[PDB]
């Protein structure tokens, strides 16, 4: 159940463990210690890069976040019952692997447009 125990669960059942998987991403003499130091520095960078993406997409502070970007049937033409009840996350990750970079670019642009509209155009004069 813990860590990756839910990995083979369906898309729907899975995610009841998002907190567990997320907390387990952080960690809690001579030359060999340098290799270990390098690994720690990289682990931090990877954590932060994911946080930077959540920031730019407007999902900071949330494990589950929705956006204003519509789903393109091109990416997948399956319905929700198949996606959430029969399919798993490992399968899904493979199914739309070639669209990840598109969706991420769209999420960044959508957030920028939202902010553009949110910005107060001198209401107070």
């Amino acid at each position: 159940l813990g860590f990756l125990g839910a990995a083979g669960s369906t898309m729907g059942a899975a995610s009841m463990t998002l907190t567990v998987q997320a907390r387990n991403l952080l960690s809690g003499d001579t030359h060999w210690g340098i290799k270990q130091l390098q690994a720690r520095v990289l682990a931090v960078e990877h954590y932060l890069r994911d946080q930077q993406l959540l920031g730019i997409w407007g999902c900071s502070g949330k494990l589950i976040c929705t956006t204003n970007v519509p789903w393109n049937s091109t990416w997948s033409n399956k319905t929700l019952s198949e996606i959430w009840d029969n399919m798993t996350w490992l399968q899904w990750d493979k199914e739309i692997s070639n669209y990840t970079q598109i969706i991420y670019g769209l999420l960044e642009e959508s957030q920028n447009q939202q902010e553009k509209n949110e910005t107060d155009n001198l209401t107070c004069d």
Binding site: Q21, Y47, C59, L80, I83
Partner: protein, 431 residues
Amino acid sequence: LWVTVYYGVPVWKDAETTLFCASHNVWATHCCVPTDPNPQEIVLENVTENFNMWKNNMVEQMHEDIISLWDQSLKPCVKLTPLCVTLNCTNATASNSSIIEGMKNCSFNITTELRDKREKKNALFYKLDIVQLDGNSSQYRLINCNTSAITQACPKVSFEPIPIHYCAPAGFAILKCNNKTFTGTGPCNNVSTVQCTHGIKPVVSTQLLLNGSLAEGEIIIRSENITDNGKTILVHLNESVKIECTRPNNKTRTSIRIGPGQAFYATGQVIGDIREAYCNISESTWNETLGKVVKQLRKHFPHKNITFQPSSGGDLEVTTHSFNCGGEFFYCNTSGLFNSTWDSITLPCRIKQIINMWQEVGRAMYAPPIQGNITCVSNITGLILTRDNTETFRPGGGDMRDNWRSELYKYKVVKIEPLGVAPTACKRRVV
């Protein structure tokens, strides 16, 4: 439908990183990190994964650490550079007759602790450790004074293998294959996740795989492209064969001071059985073991009866069975084990003090002698075989990665990828 962003999604990718080594022993000193006192394992229900024992990089990574520790452990020790002098090397006598060919009584002029003083010293050396400089002129040198320095291992430092567990860093996981019929490559339909691997002792040997784990099922023959003759075959036994090895005599050693706190340890005399080292394999066990291997081997080669031949030739490091027994290196014959077509077997064995364990151009090590007698007992858990009408098999060998692939075949390293997206019915609200 709308895009939903998720973080903490339990998915992963094949990945490479540095694993932690967990455990006056060198392995214990280096792998100072404690093991998990209560290792956990999480079975992943409805998960399949692709494993490949010939390409998982865990073997390559430990190789680098095995080499690094070996060399680093030997660096702060006595150099034998000043011993590269002409030696006399006459026939040594242990008792009575001077008939022991293997040992020579080498006398020489060597610089002592004061730089302006020199002394005549002597020690006994093995034939395999020396080379004749001028045919029939009785002038000898140590074999590695031809190309490099020889470092004497520190007598206080233990290289005895201890079990080592490799552990993933945060952000990574090690997946383990639980299929007894896996064979080394392909999908496993029963996969569990662990933080640390089982312990593996870093035992170094040739031809026969010693002190490993046993197969869960029947004998497993694991090879890449088994139909090729360019590939090595690892045979993993389901029962261990007991092997006992000994050097049946009491060695007494001297100490020659060669610098400001540095001394060379060497054989002074040997008292006891003047014969070479011997290894004993029960005959009935060996024949049963080989017959069982053949029964499984016949599944890949269901043809004419298989012939087992001795190794083909080459340097002693690759033609014989090497042993990391105590502080002495055994070079044992396998003839009689691999001479067949499909109560004890005694095999003669030579001893060397100067070795190059990792076949490094720039390295040589001198093993201080063991005072007194040695008995070494171990578990034969597998074989390294090569193949070249019927099939011919030989106790050939690889690059000593075979010694680790044989345990690290069921593990894979992956990186966790917490982000992903999926469609939903819910659009972000304006609020």
